[PDB]
């Protein structure tokens, strides 16, 4: 019958590894690099679009940076279509929590929920896992500014600075070298762009190949503002930091 | 070979190997004999033990006051099929106030076994059954195969070395069919029939199992010292 | 190589099970033809009864789907009757739900969508048949719409199906290149049937008796099949000029 | 409602009034209660207009699908399909239907299906609120094997009386004739049938 | 059950609940505690139909305790009250609704403020300086409307509460066998054992 | 290759090999036939006597559907019983809704669609039987034969099983020598002869003959088994022709 | 029976490739060329009507389809897969938007819904991916004119101009040289016809070319008058004659 | 509510009053009761106002999808069949009473529909609380072979009878004309015979008349930058 | 017993020259018993304002539901919902509970950010839209509000004049209803400024 054609997506190898998870991680290593850096006064998200065209409408385009709510955003590395399925689920979870408790969802609770959904596809159902790694940038009043990552296994961890996608080994070494705990957002903006500029597979880093976002308490008094940078604004910050 | 992985696959010569392998389980089972006259129907079964400390595996199951069977092969499969027969005999009595005809019981067993030979995921039954009974048309003996094939006979045998008993019954056909109104002589003929299938071992008091049903005789099973009279 | 057993893509972006279903289509070794008149649509098909023990009246590949729609099938009879039963059920349901007779082109689309599903879902196999639907539609007039195992469908001025479809197709093409119109300019359906049989004789290079053919005719508000004696009258008229 | 169907020598004729009421208000004075479920199988509807229209539409669908598979259905078969719907949904329906049809083998046949969903084959049938007033007249005047003209007169006179006494019935008398020759619609206006 | 009262003062919330349980003809118990601790700084008193009251209260308690363990964090009184409201608003359109009215008294450790929420079985929530359910408010609100100040001490709140209970004992037809009084503040929940 | 390991898979030819393998099981079975006569149909089957211990006349093979349809089959007997059980459900639901007993062409398609459905999926196996069936309805006598593929046609005469070639040749002679038609009683005699003649392909073991018929004049359009004197008369006629 | 294929037929290979998606893209590559160009006051989508037989009436086969009054779609790849996706896209525009908000969805969100359907055929049990790439052009009040490409994986991208299928690589280079941000709709149609001529072998006329625009509101195609706020569809399919008129000024 | 439908030479016209009520209170004085199912199929609804609007939009939505699927302009009989089967299934609980009219490739059509699922055919129809007043006018002035101008006149006169004589109806007359081979013309407020007279007095208050406790700016803007 | 008059309360909305106003009382009660004088019945999602009268549990539930839905709308659409669009969403959401409805009387008020056009709308408990040019009323004193608005209202009132008109309409209507009062709020809404004013009124 049908058993003949079953790939068995949820089995261990003899070494105790999950085949499909490992192969999905291999897929993600070819995706454009995304970086997150956490500072005392905010968080930076920077990400590289994959080899673009001059005829691509950039100002209406979104492939890397997504808003989950007013306090939490994500950077994507992997299959964009897979990511949008999970992103929509996460947006719904955040609203479910807000309706139930009348408070904004704490960052970790949202991260744990999405990560549990990823885990399920590795243990039951016989379906392929989601080929996506997320960087979560967010703020709540318990832990303040937070960075997390999750991968197709459904495992998640917290970070001061982290990269996903292509050249993460090189990127992580550069971040580990220049990162300091008392760093500020404007310094973190510069570090993120400098790291992408050195790790990129492209010839030069220009505005049309980048997506950028900041989460600042640089919002008038005790509140948080998300800023998804416009193409012209990415062009200006590239000149300011002296990359173009 | 490449066509024996499941029951849903014919071979190039039109064979169903999973069904044939299920048939093989019956041949490994212990011998059991069935025979009838015009007044009575008898089952004789050689029970098998695991070792000298163990009991002898029961072979005969009562289905109703007027019907029962003996098994050879996977015993749990006989329990499933006999339970189904008990229910069907029971449905007939409760709904129609009618004792289930032995022939109709054979048809129901055939259809239940067939469904397990044409669908994916399932497996054939691994047991053969000899059903005896007395209904409105007299004494009856049936042979069930897990292929679905059910056959009405004067006498037969299934299990290991069953060919010896089957040849004896084929010779004695004209004699034992005439044993009317004499239960003891019909059992004697059945005990003599099953003896043609024995090697190295003989019929002892905890080895032998006999069942009988007839005109004024409810289906009853004899074990222990109740069969010493026939040893 | 299990990409050849179920309907998934091969490395070339092909669906082999769909391609092999197209090959099953010619297993009966029968050719069919359809043309449009002014007021009618005619479909003819070869009839072969190879066994003397057969009842020839039951051997047929033309189906009356509804009062207005007829369907000829190229492919094995089990898959043909499967498609026929479903088309009949769909046509009847349509009339019940939407209050008017299902158009020929709409039924074709529906059956084509069902076929498309078999090419995408693994547990279902394609049907090894090509379905030619004919009618005189109340809005579009004479109509020929043909469906295949890939889920493709389109309207036709005229069409042909079977092992020798190309010979018939080219013959029909050449006629319409001369006349420069999209139909047979004839008043009566009898003469449109005569045109259809004549051009099949020309294309295949074979003569036909009354038992060698099978004919279906669609007019306004009804589709019907001709008897052997109705076909004989048609053959006599062809021979007499 | 005043509805009836009558078998005669050449086939069967269905008859009906045209009045539909909501209490004492006549919601439609020119209603067509004679309904086609197949070419030569028609029915007369009485009871809830929603129910009988819903039933007749389902039957028409069933017989259209029957025809595509098995050819022309018998009048008995059409009556059976009506019965199945009326019997199995008796709790939720208020429908009294008379089924009339013409075969060539069986000729004219009439089946009546009252409230409970039972079937009764009859030489002629009457139903609706107005039928109560013409049980006497119809029983005295019906003969088997009447001519077309005699049967038209019998129905015209019968429904005339039903209309005269039943406030729920009125308007025009519609009729449908079912024979080998085909299907003929007839209509008779108040100025004609009131002076009978 | 019968009378449940609440009052939010300067630095604490005080809940008072009757002790009687009546099975129609007889008073079966005169020491019943109509309250459940949901978290270290959140208390819920309840009244309504028999069985459903305790079943609902313990169900809520289990859920809040589950949240506390999962997150290693105590939900704010506002968040707990919203969760409870939703459960009752869900319940009112169920096959058989919870016939339970509650008061939620909590001390918010983040804002350093006491908070009192009144929720009825329909899922009707209001935040109040003082509240009640049933007929309790009909007898006590005129006294609370007169004497209440937002800057009252806990001792002044207890005294105003005594005046409310005295008026209930005078004008109510039912004998509710006194009240158990509990205080919710920055240090948690405690019971006043002499009232 | 591998196209023959799973049902419903098209080979590069456009063939379903699993259905073709089911035909091999049919060809391995005993001979069964059907003859269409003037006002009805006759069915006959070869029953191999494997042993003396088989009770004569007891293991009945031909099956009735409703009261007017007979069914016989060659191949896997349980598969045939499963198909007849479905046929009995189809006939019951038809009569329930439409009142009239199911017409034979209508019944033929019900079996056809069901057998065809077992060629659409790999989760089921095709039927290992060819079924000869028919009876009398309002339009007269009808005889059908249905294959594992779901394919069926109407027949003047039909045969299947191990001795089908022999039987077919005998049936073809009857069609040629009787264009006007055959009577029901003649058809019973001829059916006996053809089974006896077809038994040459199964000559090792002896057999038991079983005949049934539906005729407008002889059985009032109901299916009945040929028994007693009429069966013996047919056996005598058959034995006379082989000698 | 029952669908017993409850497992994924698309899985990751050791190299991280999703084979079935790659193979679906290969099927799209074999497909007939289709393109889209965005102007300041409109959008144009175009393709070749590759007729399978001259006896076939190619007007009965619509490669360019109306999804909403202000949104249209064209494809390259497997035609039948496209046809069912158009059916699903038309329905989802109503069920998940118009029946909720009382208005037609904006282009980007309808594209998002179609993308989701294509993504699910890449992960759900017992199905293969859709073998098509779509180009979807549309207009809505707050986003203006827009053009999107949707691939078998479910991924979608906005374009100023692009091409998919057979001769897409050459066509995209041709479009890069001609496109600017000051093009009027008539200029974009002209460029579309020029670009499409390069990938067409045989006849090149109004009967072999299918072309539609998203432009001004067409009150003449509304079918009713009396409601000032309803001004008609922005989607319009050009006629055979209208295409031929612009082929003389070519 | 008063709604009518009238057939004429080359098409069909429907009309309605513009008053919607909640018991004896007028909720809206200029209500729109003429609903569009498709460009050339319009219906007018009486009964539960949410139901008539909801059932019209559902069937209108499904009619649009059907039209796209079949590449044909929608038919009135399709709208009728879909509406009656939907309403029958809900056994009268969906309280929609409709007059459905339109033109299609088959011709011009006029039907009515009761909440329980029954339909009828006619040359002139009326529904709603003012249907008896309207039907009185229709039965007095209807004839065969009416012109477009005569049918509009008759339809609006029938609505006026409902406006003046039925307390459930009032305000203005809305009309929609559907002619074969033409665009359907929706004539909103075709007649306006109920304008309120000028009041005797102005009730504009002096500024500062109302006592105020607190004032504050409401932040409707999103969280700001910097 | 009647769910729509257990808790009491009223909402009124009006249009003016380049502005809209929406107002409500502050009472929540259990029939005769006054429970709260701070129960505001007007909410806003971006620049769109929603007033809701009726059963208080459903008032709270629907606010939470429309906050839920308008937040998801904004994330997907990348813009704030408009009054016309939100009106359809309210109608759709209410009708989905056709045979088990929320016992409420919603009122929408706002200015379209692109056209600048003032907009108001009202609904029955099951979704029927009343889109009036002049004014919308809702609640246990809707009869009284209809009487006030019909005489006090005139078109094209300036923002500060509209405030006086709607305030006097609410106050005097509430004082003739036992289940309305205990305070009041008035929102004056212009294209890019909104002023909120609490009114002084009798507390019985
Ligand atoms: Cl479809
Ligand atoms: Mg498949
Ligand atoms: Mg009368
Ligand atoms: Mg008051
Ligand atoms: Mg008072």
CATH number for the domain including H80?
A: 3.60.20.10
What's the domain range around H122?
Answer: 1-226
CATH architecture of the domain with residue range F1-243:
4-Layer Sandwich (3.60)
H41-47 and H34-38: which strand pairing?
A: antiparallel
Structure token digits, residue D7: 């078998």
Structure token digits, residue C13: 């972006």
Q: Do chains I and D touch (3 or more CB pairs under 8 A)?
A: no
For residue E5, the 8-state DSSP code is E
Chain A residues in contact with I71 by the CB 8 A cut-off are 69, 95, 98
Under CATH, which number does the domain B1-231 receive?
3.60.20.10
CA of I204 to the centre of ligand 5 (A): 4
Q: What's the distance, CA H150 to chain centroid?
A: 21
Chain H residues in contact with I196 by the CB 8 A cut-off are 215-218
Among candidate residues B58, B53, B92, the one with its CA nearest the CA of residue B75: B58
**Would you tell me which residues 55-114 of chain E have a C-beta closer than 8 angstroms to some C-beta of chain I?**
85, 88-89, 92-93
Structure token digits, residue E18: 């009757």
d(CA F143, CA B44): 47
Put simply, whether H32 touches G (Cβ < 8 Å) is: no
User: Which residues from A are below 8 Å from I when comparing CB atoms?
Assistant: 67-69, 91-92, 95-96, 98-99, 102
Put simply, whether G4 touches A (Cβ < 8 Å) is: yes
H124-127 and H119-121: which strand pairing?
A: unpaired
CA distance I29 to chain H (A): 23
What total number of domains does chain G contain? 1
CA distance F219 to chain C (A): 23
d(CA C196, CA C132): 15
Among candidate residues D73, D75, D52, D55, the one with its CA nearest the CA of residue D64: D73
d(CA C102, CA G135): 32
Q: Please, what is the Cα angle at F83 between F85 and B133, to 5 degrees?
A: 50
Tell me if A175 sits within 8 A of A193, measured CB to CB.
no
Structure token digits, residue D6: 């009558």
Sequence-distant (6+) residues with CB within 8 A of F136 are F39, F40, F41, F68, F104, F142, F214, F215, F216, F221
E26-29 and E21-23: which strand pairing?
A: antiparallel
Candidates D21, D33, D46, D50, partner chain H, best to mutate (most H CBs within 10 A): D50
CATH of the domain at A227: 3.60.20.10
Among chain A residues, CA nearest to G125: A127
Q: What's the distance, CA I112 to chain centroid?
A: 17
DSSP string, chain C: -GGGTSS---TTS--HHHHHHHHHTTTT---EEEEE-SS-EEEEEE-----TTB-GGG---EEE-SSS-EEEEES-HHHHHHHHHHHHHHHHHHHHHHSSPPPHHHHHHHHHHHHHHHHHBSSSPPPS-EEEEEEEETTTEEEEEEE-TTS-EEEESEEEESTTHHHHHHHHHHHHHHH-SSS---SSHHHHHHHHHHHHHHHHT----TTSEEEEEEETTEEEE--HHHHHHHHHHHHT-
d(CA D41, CA D80): 13
Calculate the alpha carbon distances from B132 to B76, B104, I22 in Å: 20, 13, 90
Report the SS3 class of residue E148.
coil
Partner residues linked to A148 by β-bridges = A136, A158
Report the SS3 class of residue H56.
helix
For chain I, the first-to-last Cα distance in angstroms comes to 23
Structure token digits, residue I184: 């009041």
The upper half-sphere exposure of residue G163, i.e. CA atoms within 13 Å in the direction of its Cβ, equals: 26
Sequence-distant (6+) residues with CB within 8 A of F116 are C78, C79, C81, C82, F149, F150
CA distance I57 to chain A (A): 14
| Domain D1-196 CATH assignment equals 1.10.3720.10 | no
Among candidate residues E163, E162, E164, E193, the one with its CA nearest the CA of residue E180: E193
Sequence-distant (6+) residues with CB within 8 A of A12 are A18
Q: For F29-141, where are the alpha helices, taking DSSP H only?
A: 77-98, 104-117
The upper half-sphere exposure of residue A180, i.e. CA atoms within 13 Å in the direction of its Cβ, equals: 5
Q: Burial letters for B47-56: b for 16+ Cβ neighbours within 10 Å, e otherwise?
A: bbeeeeeeeb
Backbone phi, psi, residue H94, to 5°:
-85, 105
Backbone phi, psi, residue G185, to 5°:
-55, -40
Structure token digits, residue F16: 């379903």
Q: Please, what is the Cα angle at I45 between I42 and I50, to 5 degrees?
A: 30
For residue H200, the 8-state DSSP code is S
For residue A56, the 8-state DSSP code is B
Structure token digits, residue B90: 């029971």
d(CA D135, CA D123): 14
H184-191 and G224-225: which strand pairing?
A: parallel
Report the SS3 class of residue B219.
strand
Chain A residues in contact with C6 by the CB 8 A cut-off are 5
Calculate the alpha carbon distances from C197 to C49, C57, C166, C201, C228 in Å: 19, 20, 16, 6, 14
- The closest ligand to the CA of I180 turns out to be 4
What's the domain range around C2?
Answer: 1-241
CATH of the domain at C102: 3.60.20.10
d(CA E120, CA E98): 10
CA of G84 to the centre of ligand 1 (A): 7
Tell me if G82 sits within 8 A of G60, measured CB to CB.
no
Considering only CB atoms, H220 lies closest to which of I122, I194, I200, namely: I194
CATH of region E1-195, choose from 3.40.50.10300, 3.40.50.1820, 1.10.10.60, 3.60.20.10 = 3.60.20.10
d(CA C18, CA C119): 7
Partner residues linked to A14 by β-bridges = none
Structure token digits, residue E6: 């609440």
- The closest ligand to the CA of I178 turns out to be 4
CA distance F105 to chain B (A): 26
Q: Which residue bears the tokens 């107002």? A: I23
d(CA E88, CA E103): 13
Considering only CB atoms, F125 lies closest to which of B2, B8, B152, namely: B8
d(CA F232, CA F236): 6
d(CA D27, CA H97): 13
Rg, Å, chain E Cα set: 16
- The closest ligand to the CA of I182 turns out to be 4
Among candidate residues A223, A209, A11, the one with its CA nearest the CA of residue A104: A223
**Other residues' Cβ atoms within 10 Å of the Cβ of residue A180:** 9
Chain A residues in contact with H223 by the CB 8 A cut-off are 70, 219, 223-225
d(CA A43, CA A61): 22
Q: Which residue bears the tokens 């079935």? A: G20
Candidates F1, F50, F55, F115, partner chain B, best to mutate (most B CBs within 10 A): F55
CA of D112 to the centre of ligand 4 (A): 66
d(CA H120, CA H127): 12
For chain G, the first-to-last Cα distance in angstroms comes to 59
Tell me if F188 sits within 8 A of F231, measured CB to CB.
no
Among F1, F30, F31, F119, the active-site one is F30
Q: Which residue bears the tokens 């108040």? A: D190
DSSP string, F183-238: -HHHHHHHHHHHHHHHGGGGTTS-EEEEEEEEETTTSTT-EEE--HHHHHHHHHHH
Calculate the alpha carbon distances from D11 to A153, D42, I34, I172 in Å: 79, 13, 80, 79
C142 conformational bin, left if phi > 0, alpha if psi -120 to 50, beta if neither: beta
Put simply, whether A42 touches E (Cβ < 8 Å) is: no
Sequence-distant (6+) residues with CB within 8 A of C21 are C125, C126, C127, C128, C149, F10, F14
Among candidate residues E69, B35, E92, D48, the one with its CA nearest the CA of residue I61: E92
In chain I, at which residue ranges do the beta strands (DSSP E only) sit?
Answer: 10-16, 19-25, 28-30, 33-36, 42-45, 48-54, 104-111, 118-123, 129-130, 135-139, 184-190, 193-199
Q: What's the distance, CA F28 to chain centroid?
A: 15
Put simply, whether F101 touches D (Cβ < 8 Å) is: no
What total number of domains does chain C contain? 1
| Range A154-160, long-range pairs (CB < 8 A, 24+ positions) | A154/A115, A154/A116, A154/A117, A154/A118, A154/A119, A154/A120, A154/A121, A154/A122, A155/A115, A156/A111, A156/A112, A156/A115, A159/A36, A159/A38, A160/A37, A160/A38
d(CA I162, CA I19): 9
Structure token digits, residue A41: 């006064």
What's the domain range around A107?
Answer: 1-244
DSSP string, D33-59: -EEEEETTEEEEEEE-HHHHHHHHHHH
E179-185 and E188-192: which strand pairing?
A: antiparallel
Tell me if G185 sits within 8 A of G39, measured CB to CB.
yes
Structure token digits, residue D64: 């259209």
The structure was resolved experimentally with X-ray
Among candidate residues E59, E67, E50, the one with its CA nearest the CA of residue E2: E50
Among candidate residues A74, A3, A62, the one with its CA nearest the CA of residue A34: A74
Tell me if B138 sits within 8 A of B128, measured CB to CB.
no
d(CA G201, CA B171): 88
d(CA A86, CA G42): 34
For residue D63, the 8-state DSSP code is H
Put simply, whether C148 touches F (Cβ < 8 Å) is: no
Chain F residues in contact with B16 by the CB 8 A cut-off are 125, 128
- The closest ligand to the CA of D172 turns out to be 3
Tell me if C189 sits within 8 A of G89, measured CB to CB.
no
CA of C38 to the centre of ligand 5 (A): 86
Partner residues linked to G45 by β-bridges = G36, G212
Q: Which residue bears the tokens 């016809």? A: G193
CA distance B161 to chain A (A): 37
Q: Do chains G and E touch (3 or more CB pairs under 8 A)?
A: no
Resolution stated for this PDB structure, in Å: 2.5
Among candidate residues F119, F127, F113, D72, the one with its CA nearest the CA of residue C84: F113
């Amino acid at each position: 019958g049908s058993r003949r054609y079953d790939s068995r997506t949820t089995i261990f190898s003899p070494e105790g590894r999950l085949y499909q998870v490992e192969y999905a991680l291999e897929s993600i290593s070819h995706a454009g690099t995304a970086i997150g850096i956490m500072a005392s006064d905010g968080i930076v998200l920077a990400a590289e679009r994959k080899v673009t065209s001059t005829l691509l409408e950039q100002d209406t385009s979104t492939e890397k940076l997504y808003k989950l709510n007013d306090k939490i955003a994500v950077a994507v590395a992997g299959l964009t279509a897979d990511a949008e399925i999970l992103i929509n689920t996460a947006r719904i979870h955040a609203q479910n929590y807000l309706k139930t408790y009348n408070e904004d969802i704490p960052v970790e609770i949202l991260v744990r929920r999405l990560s549990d959904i990823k885990q399920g596809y590795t243990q039951h159902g016989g379906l392929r896992p989601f080929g996506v790694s997320f960087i979560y940038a967010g703020y709540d009043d318990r832990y303040g500014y937070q960075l997390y990552t999750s991968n197709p296994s459904g495992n998640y961890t917290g970070w001061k600075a982290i990269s996903v996608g292509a050249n993460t080994s090189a990127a992580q070494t550069l971040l580990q070298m220049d990162y300091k705990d008392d760093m500020k957002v404007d310094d973190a903006i510069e570090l993120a762009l400098k790291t992408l500029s050195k790790t990129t597979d492209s010839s030069a880093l220009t505005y049309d190949r980048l997506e950028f976002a900041t989460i600042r308490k640089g919002a008038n008094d005790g509140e948080v503002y998300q800023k998804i940078f416009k193409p012209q604004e990415i062009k200006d910050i590239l000149v300011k930091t002296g990359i173009t | 070979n490449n066509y024996d992985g499941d029951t849903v696959t014919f071979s190039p010569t039109g064979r169903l190997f999973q069904v044939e392998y299920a048939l093989e389980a019956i041949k490994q089972g212990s011998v059991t004999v069935g025979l009838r006259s015009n007044t009575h129907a008898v089952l004789v079964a050689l029970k098998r033990n695991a070792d000298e400390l163990s009991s002898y595996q029961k072979k005969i199951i009562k289905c109703d006051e007027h019907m029962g069977l003996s098994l050879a092969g996977l015993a749990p499969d006989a329990r499933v099929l006999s339970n189904y027969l008990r229910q069907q005999c029971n449905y007939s009595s409760l709904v129609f106030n009618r004792k289930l005809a032995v022939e109709r019981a054979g048809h129901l067993l055939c259809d239940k076994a067939q469904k397990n030979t044409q669908s994916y995921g399932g497996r054939p039954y691994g047991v053969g059954l000899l059903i005896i009974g007395y209904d409105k048309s007299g004494a009856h003996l049936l042979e069930f195969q897990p292929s679905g094939n059910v056959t009405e006979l004067y006498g037969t045998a299934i299990g290991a070395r069953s060919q010896g008993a089957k040849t004896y019954l084929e010779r004695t056909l004209d004699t034992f069919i005439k044993i009317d109104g004499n239960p003891d002589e019909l059992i004697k003929a059945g005990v003599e029939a099953i003896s043609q299938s024995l090697r190295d071992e003989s019929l002892t008091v905890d080895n032998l199992s006999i069942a009988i049903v007839g005109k004024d005789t409810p289906f009853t099973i004899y074990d222990g010292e109740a069969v010493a009279k026939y040893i | 190589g299990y990409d050849r057993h179920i309907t998934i893509f091969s490395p070339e972006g092909r669906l082999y099970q769909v391609e092999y279903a197209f090959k099953a289509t010619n297993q009966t070794n029968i050719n069919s033809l359809a043309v449009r008149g002014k007021d009618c649509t005619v479909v003819i098909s070869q009839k072969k009864v190879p066994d003397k023990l057969l009842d020839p009246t039951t051997v047929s590949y033309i189906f009356c789907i509804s009062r207005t729609i007829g369907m000829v099938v190229n492919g094995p009879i089990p898959d043909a009757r499967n498609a026929a039963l479903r088309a009949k059920a769909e046509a009847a349901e349509f009339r019940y739900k939407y209050g008017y007779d299902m158009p020929c082109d709409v039924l074709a689309k529906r059956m084509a969508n069902l076929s498309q599903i078999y090419t995408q879902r693994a547990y279902m196999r394609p049907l090894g048949v090509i379905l030619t639907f004919v009618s005189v539609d109340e809005e579009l007039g004479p109509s020929i719409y043909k469906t295949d195992p890939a889920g493709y469908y389109v309207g036709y001025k005229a069409t042909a199906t079977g092992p020798k479809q190309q010979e018939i197709t080219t013959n029909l093409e050449n006629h319409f290149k001369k006349s420069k119109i999209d139909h047979i300019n004839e008043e009566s359906w009898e003469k449109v049937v005569e045109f259809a049989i004549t051009h099949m004789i020309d294309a295949l290079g074979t003569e036909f008796s009354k038992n060698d053919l099978e004919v279906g005719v669609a007019t306004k508000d009804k589709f019907f099949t001709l008897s052997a004696e109705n076909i004989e009258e048609r053959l006599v008229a062809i021979a007499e000029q | 409602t005043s509805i009836m169907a009558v078998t005669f020598k050449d086939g069967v004729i269905l008859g009906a009034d045209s009045r539909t009421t909501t209490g004492a208000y006549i919601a439609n004075r020119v209603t067509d209660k004679l309904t086609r479920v197949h070419d030569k199988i028609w029915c007369c509807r009485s009871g809830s207009a929603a129910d009988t229209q819903a039933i007749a539409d389902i039957v028409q669908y069933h017989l259209e699908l029957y025809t595509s598979q098995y050819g022309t259905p018998s009048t008995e078969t059409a009556a059976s399909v009506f019965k199945e719907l009326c019997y199995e949904n008796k709790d939720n329906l208020t429908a009294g239907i008379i089924v009339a049809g013409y075969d060539d083998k069986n000729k004219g046949e009439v089946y009546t299906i009252p409230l409970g969903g039972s079937v009764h084959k009859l030489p002629y049938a009457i139903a609706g609120s107005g039928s109560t007033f013409i049980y006497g007249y119809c029983d005295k005047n019906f003969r088997e094997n009447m001519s077309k003209e005699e049967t038209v007169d019998f129905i015209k006179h019968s429904l005339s009386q039903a209309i005269k006494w039943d406030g729920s019935s009125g308007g025009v008398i519609r009729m449908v004739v079912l024979t080998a020759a085909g299907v003929e619609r007839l209509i008779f206006y108040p100025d004609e049938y009131e002076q009978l | 059950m019968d009378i449940i009262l609440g009052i939010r003062v300067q630095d604490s919330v005080i809940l008072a609940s009757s002790k009687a349980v009546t099975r129609g003809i007889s008073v079966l118990k005169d020491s019943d505690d109509k309250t459940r601790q949901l978290s270290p700084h959140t208390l819920m008193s309840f009244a309504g139909e028999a069985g459903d009251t305790v079943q609902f209260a313990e169900y809520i308690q289990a859920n809040i305790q589950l949240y506390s363990i999962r997150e290693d964090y105590e939900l704010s009184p506002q968040a707990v009250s919203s969760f409870v409201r939703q459960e009752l608003a869900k319940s009112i359109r169920s096959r058989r609704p919870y016939q339970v009215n509650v008061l939620i008294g909590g001390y918010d450790k983040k804002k350093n403020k006491p908070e009192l929420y009144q929720i009825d079985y329909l899922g009707t929530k209001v935040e109040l300086p003082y509240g009640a359910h049933g007929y309790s408010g009909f007898y006590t609100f005129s006294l609370l409307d007169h004497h209440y100040r937002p800057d009252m001490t806990t001792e002044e709140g207890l005294d105003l509460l005594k005046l409310c209970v005295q008026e209930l004992e005078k004008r109510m037809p039912m004998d509710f066998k006194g009240v158990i009084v509990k205080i919710v503040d920055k240090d948690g929940i405690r019971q006043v054992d002499d009232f | 290759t591998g196209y023959d390991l799973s049902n419903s898979v098209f080979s590069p030819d456009g063939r379903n090999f699993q259905v073709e393998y089911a035909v091999k099981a049919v060809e391995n079975g005993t001979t069964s036939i059907g003859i269409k006569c003037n006002d009805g149909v006759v069915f006959a089957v070869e029953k191999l006597i494997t042993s003396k211990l088989l009770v004569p006349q007891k293991n009945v093979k031909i099956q009735v559907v409703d009261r007017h349809i007979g069914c016989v089959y060659s191949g896997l007997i349980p598969d045939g019983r499963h198909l007849v059980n479905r046929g009995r459900e189809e006939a019951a639901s038809f009569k329930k809704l439409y009142k009239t007993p199911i017409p034979i062409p209508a019944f033929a398609d019900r079996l056809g669609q069901y057998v065809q459905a077992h060629t659409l999926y790999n989760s089921v196996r095709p039927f290992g039987v060819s079924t000869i069936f028919g009876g009398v309805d309002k339009n007269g006598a009808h005889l059908y034969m249905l294959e594992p593929s779901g394919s069926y046609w109407g027949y003047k005469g039909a045969a299947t099983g191990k001795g089908r070639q022999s039987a077919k040749a005998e049936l073809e002679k009857l069609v040629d020598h009787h264009p006007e038609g055959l009577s029901a009683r003649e058809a019973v005699k001829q059916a006996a002869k053809i089974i006896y003649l077809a038994h040459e392909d199964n000559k090792e073991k002896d057999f038991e003959l079983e005949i049934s018929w539906c005729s407008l004049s002889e059985t009032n359009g109901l299916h009945k088994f040929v028994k007693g004197d009429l069966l013996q008369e047919a056996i005598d006629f058959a034995q006379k022709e082989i000698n | 029976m029952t669908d017993r294929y409850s497992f994924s037929l698309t899985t990751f290979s050791p190299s991280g490739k999703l084979g079935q998606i790659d193979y679906a893209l290969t099927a799209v590559k074999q497909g007939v060329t289709s393109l889209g160009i965005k102007a300041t006051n409109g959008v144009v989508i175009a393709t070749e009507k590759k007729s399978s037989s001259p006896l076939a009436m190619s007007e009965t086969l619509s490669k360019v389809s109306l999804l909403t009054p202000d949104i249209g779609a064209v494809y390259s790849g497997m035609g039948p897969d496209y046809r069912v996706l158009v059916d699903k896209s038309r329905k989802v525009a109503h069920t998940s938007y118009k029946r909720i908000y009382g208005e037609y969805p904006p282009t980007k969100l309808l594209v998002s819904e179609v993308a989701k359907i294509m993504q699910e055929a890449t992960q759900s049990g017992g199905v293969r991916p859709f073998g098509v790439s779509l180009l979807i052009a549309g207009h809505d009040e707050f986003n203006g004119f827009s053009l999107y490409q949707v691939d078998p994986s479910g991924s979608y991208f906005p374009w100023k101009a692009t091409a998919i299928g057979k001769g897409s690589v050459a066509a995209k280079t041709f479009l890069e040289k001609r496109w600017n941000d000051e093009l009027e709709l008539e200029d974009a149609i002209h460029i579309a016809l020029l670009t499409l001529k390069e990938s067409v072998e045989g006849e090149f006329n109004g009967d072999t070319i299918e072309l539609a625009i998203i432009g001004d509101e067409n009150p003449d195609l509304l079918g009713y008058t009396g409601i000032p706020t309803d001004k008609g569809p922005r989607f319009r399919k050009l006629t055979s004659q209208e295409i031929n008129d612009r082929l003389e000024a070519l | 509510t008063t709604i009518v439908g009238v057939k004429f030479n080359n098409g069909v016209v429907i009309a309605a009053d513009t008053r919607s009520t909640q018991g004896p209170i007028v909720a809206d004085k200029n209500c729109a009761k003429l609903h569009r199912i498709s460009p050339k199929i319009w219906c007018a609804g009486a009964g539960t106002a949410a139901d008539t609007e909801a059932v019209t939009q559902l069937i209108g939505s499904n009619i649009e999808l059907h039209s796209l699927y079949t590449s044909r302009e929608p038919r009135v009989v399709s709208a009728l069949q879909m509406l009656k089967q939907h309403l029958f299934k809900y056994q009268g609980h969906i309280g929609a009473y409709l007059i459905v009219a339109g033109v299609d490739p088959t011709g011009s059509h006029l039907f009515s529909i009761d909440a329980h699922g029954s339909t009828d055919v006619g040359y002139y129809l009326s529904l709603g609380s003012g249907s008896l007043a309207a039907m009185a006018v229709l039965e007095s002035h209807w004839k065969q072979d009416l012109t477009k101008e005569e049918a509009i006149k008759l339809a609006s006169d029938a609505i006026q009878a409902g406006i003046w004589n039925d307390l459930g109806s009032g305000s203005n007359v809305d009309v929609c004309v559907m002619e074969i081979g033409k665009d359907a013309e929706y004539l909103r407020n075709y007649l306006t015979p109920n304008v309120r007279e000028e009041k005797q007095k102005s009730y504009k208050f002096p500024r500062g008349t109302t006592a105020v406790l607190k004032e504050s700016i409401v932040n409707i803007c999103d969280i700001q930058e910097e | 017993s009647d769910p729509s008059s257990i808790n009491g309360g009223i909402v009124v909305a009006m249009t003016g020259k380049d502005c809209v106003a929406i107002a409500c009382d502050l009472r929540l009660g259990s029939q005769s018993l006054g429970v709260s004088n701070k129960f505001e019945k007007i909410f806003h999602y971006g620049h769109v304002f929603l007033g809701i009268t009726g059963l208080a549990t459903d008032v709270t539930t629907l606010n939470e539901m429309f906050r839920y839905k308008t937040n998801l709308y904004k994330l997907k659409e990348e813009r704030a919902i408009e009054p016309e669009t939100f009106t359809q969403l309210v109608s759709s959401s209410l009708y989905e509970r056709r045979f088990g409805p929320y016992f409420v009387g919603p009122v929408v008020a706002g200015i379209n950010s692109k056209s600048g056009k003032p907009f108001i709308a009202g609904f029955d408990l099951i979704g029927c839209i009343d889109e009036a040019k002049d004014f919308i009323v809702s609640g246990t004193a809707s009869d009284q509000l209809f009487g006030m608005c019909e005489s006090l209202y005139e078109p094209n009132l300036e923002p500060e004049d509209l405030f006086e008109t709607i305030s006097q309409a609410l106050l005097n209507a509430a004082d003739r209803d036992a289940l309305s009062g205990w305070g009041a709020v008035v929102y004056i809404i212009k294209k890019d400024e909104v002023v909120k004013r609490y009114l002084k009124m009798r507390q019985d």
